[PDB]
Amino acid sequence: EMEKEFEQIDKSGSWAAIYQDIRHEASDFPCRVAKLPKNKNRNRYRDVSPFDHSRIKLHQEDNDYINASLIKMEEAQRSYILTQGPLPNTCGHFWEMVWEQKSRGVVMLNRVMEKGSLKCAQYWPQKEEKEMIFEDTNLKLTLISEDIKSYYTVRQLELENLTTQETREILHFHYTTWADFGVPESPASFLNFLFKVRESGSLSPEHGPVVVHCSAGIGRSGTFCLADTCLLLMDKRKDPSSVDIKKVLLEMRKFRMGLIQTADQLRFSYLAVIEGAKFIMGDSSVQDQWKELSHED
């Protein structure tokens, strides 16, 4: 039981040792494309790169590189694209990826400005009447509407391929109070947000993989994906005891390095999965309780 092990780790005060064990066991695969000289200005962080085997390729002749990884969870049958916060020169690439991969939702777990520094380009329009055109990838992006809550904002965007005039609705789920190298305010607040993404249809198999990013796309992004996958696995046979969280994280780390950046994020991941199990195991009313506890307005 993840709960029985959670209590053991807490009593031992061994979250740091557990977390370092995962670091030591994690997969190591080449990132040769990411390290090519011509891609240096496409990477936000020197030490966060996509593995070659799992990287998303842009469908263009010139340079197909974007710092983005396809995390394909075979047993859970869910996929995610994890990517860095777009740079000023990679916003067109970012939306090209969204188009080519047929994603329906973008989950953003950071703010543009965090700890007095710019963590992410302003890659979507903040005003309906000021749309964005990405000339390098021939895409147009319009803000359609916005639903602002206390700690998160949901936006409806229209993405248009200008070459064909095809248009798609993109949902943007923006968690605005989650500090880098931090944890959410509560399991309830995090799960309320996760179930909002789930409820929108953005995670469903008829769409492309959801795009998840923070600044580097590994820490907060890893926490989000790990909790979601763990809850989905539990859902499939109604068996909380069959879910080994550490092994799920290690499986995810076969597809992108560094997922979950602190021991307390790992610890939080356990808390979120343990609490979310109440919903999975038949207590539907807990979802309402999360929404109230989250004080979203």
Swiss-Prot record:
Subcellular location: Endoplasmic reticulum membrane
Reactions the enzyme catalyzes: O-phospho-L-tyrosyl-[protein] + H2O = L-tyrosyl-[protein] + phosphate
Summary of the tissues where the protein is detected: Expressed in keratinocytes (at protein level).
Membrane topology: Peripheral membrane protein
Modified positions (Cysteine persulfide) in chain numbering: 214
Recorded GO CC terms: cytoplasm; cytoplasmic side of endoplasmic reticulum membrane; cytosol; early endosome; endoplasmic reticulum; endosome lumen; glutamatergic synapse; mitochondrial crista
Keywords: Acetylation, Endoplasmic reticulum, Hydrolase, Membrane, Oxidation, Phosphoprotein, Protein phosphatase, S-nitrosylation
Class of the enzyme per the UniProt entry, highest EC level: hydrolase
Membrane-crossing segments per the record: none
Positions carrying Cysteine sulfenic acid (-SOH): 214
GO biological process, one term: cellular response to angiotensin
Residues the entry annotates as binding substrate: 180, 214-220, 261
Domain Tyrosine-protein phosphatase: residue ranges: 2-276
PTM remark: Oxidized on Cys-214; the Cys-SOH formed in response to redox signaling reacts with the alpha-amido of the following residue to form a sulfenamide cross-link, triggering a conformational change that inhibits substrate binding and activity. The active site can be restored by reduction.
Entry-annotated residues carrying S-nitrosocysteine: 214
EC numbers: 3.1.3.48
In-chain residues carrying the UniProt-annotated modification Phosphotyrosine: 19, 65
Linked residues for N,N-(cysteine-1,S-diyl)serine (Cys-Ser): 214-215
Function: Tyrosine-protein phosphatase which acts as a regulator of endoplasmic reticulum unfolded protein response. Mediates dephosphorylation of EIF2AK3/PERK; inactivating the protein kinase activity of EIF2AK3/PERK. May play an important role in CKII- and p60c-src-induced signal transduction cascades. May regulate the EFNA5-EPHA3 signaling pathway which modulates cell reorganization and cell-cell repulsion. May also regulate the hepatocyte growth factor receptor signaling pathway through dephosphorylation of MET.
Assembly description: Interacts with EPHA3 (phosphorylated); dephosphorylates EPHA3 and may regulate its trafficking and function. Interacts with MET. Interacts with NCK1.
UniProt similarity note: Belongs to the protein-tyrosine phosphatase family. Non-receptor class 1 subfamily.
Annotated protein name in UniProt: Tyrosine-protein phosphatase non-receptor type 1
Organism: Homo sapiens
Gene designation: PTPN1
